[PDB]
């Protein structure tokens, strides 16, 4: 397996090179946005980002080693967490605002357009605030994102075959932990500081899991209110939960 022999610097390099692009919305400042149309814009964007996410996942060391059934399950479990942490990362330099796209920068008050969106906006803003508080580094962020992909579905997977699968993901996960520590040591942190920061970073993943489940419930709400149009891929991703 290529993934398991990677060095810390090659892991960072591979994760940085696989970063998907930042996409534009169809937002038109002059066009009036209803509650629905603003939600059509955001779900339109998420659907396009999911296509890039799927192809990004293929470039995460070790992901393609899994069965296609395992790949489908990890993404079905992780996709909303991955969209949200990317959103939080993009919005980190814009306090009190969420940068859904370079041309679409929203604040809490505007997030009150869609019933139910205010609470999730606040959590995303709270997470971005934490990222700023900790001065999260881009190299740390790409590590966190691959951890989410590998970790979020690894305990809802049969045979002793499906158990060798789970065992391989753990070795890759341990490699990403080594990579995180390597980064912090290079940045001149003491060992106590490295362990404290490692913990601070992984604890955020619990809050991202929380926001994802709250978000999955909002998207299911939108769905059978049948006002915001939703893509076929989002609907299938929704059904996975």
């Amino acid at each position: 397996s290529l993934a398991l022999s990677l060095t810390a610097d090659q892991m960072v390099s591979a994760l940085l090179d696989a970063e998907p692009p930042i996409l534009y919305s169809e937002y038109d400042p002059t066009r009036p946005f209803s509650e629905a149309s603003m939600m059509g814009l955001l779900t339109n964007l998420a659907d396009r980002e999911l296509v890039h996410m799927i192809n990004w996942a293929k470039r995460v060391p070790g992901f393609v080693d899994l069965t296609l059934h395992d790949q489908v399950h990890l993404l079905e479990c992780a996709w909303l967490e991955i969209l949200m942490i990317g959103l939080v990362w993009r919005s980190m330099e814009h306090p009190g605002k969420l940068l859904f796209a370079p041309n679409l920068l929203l604040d809490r008050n505007q997030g009150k357009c869609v019933e139910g969106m205010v609470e999730i906006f606040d959590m995303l803003l709270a997470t971005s605030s934490r990222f700023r508080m900790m001065n999260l580094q881009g190299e740390e962020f790409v590590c966190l994102k691959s951890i989410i992909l590998l970790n979020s579905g690894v305990y809802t997977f049969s045979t002793l075959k499906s158990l060798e699968e789970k065992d391989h993901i753990h070795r890759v996960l341990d490699k990403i932990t080594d990579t995180l520590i390597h980064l912090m040591a290079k940045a001149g942190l003491t060992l106590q500081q490295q362990h404290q920061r490692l913990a601070q970073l992984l604890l955020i993943l619990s809050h991202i899991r929380h926001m994802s489940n709250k978000g999955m419930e909002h998207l299911y709400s939108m769905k059978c209110k049948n006002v915001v149009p939703l893509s076929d891929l989002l609907l299938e991703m929704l059904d996975a939960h």
Binding site: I54, N55, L68, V72, L75, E76, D232, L233, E236, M237
Partner: peptide, 9 residues
């Protein structure tokens, strides 16, 4: 499954 497809290509 759309995701199934997209992973395969």
């Amino acid at each position: 499954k759309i995701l199934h497809r997209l992973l395969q290509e």
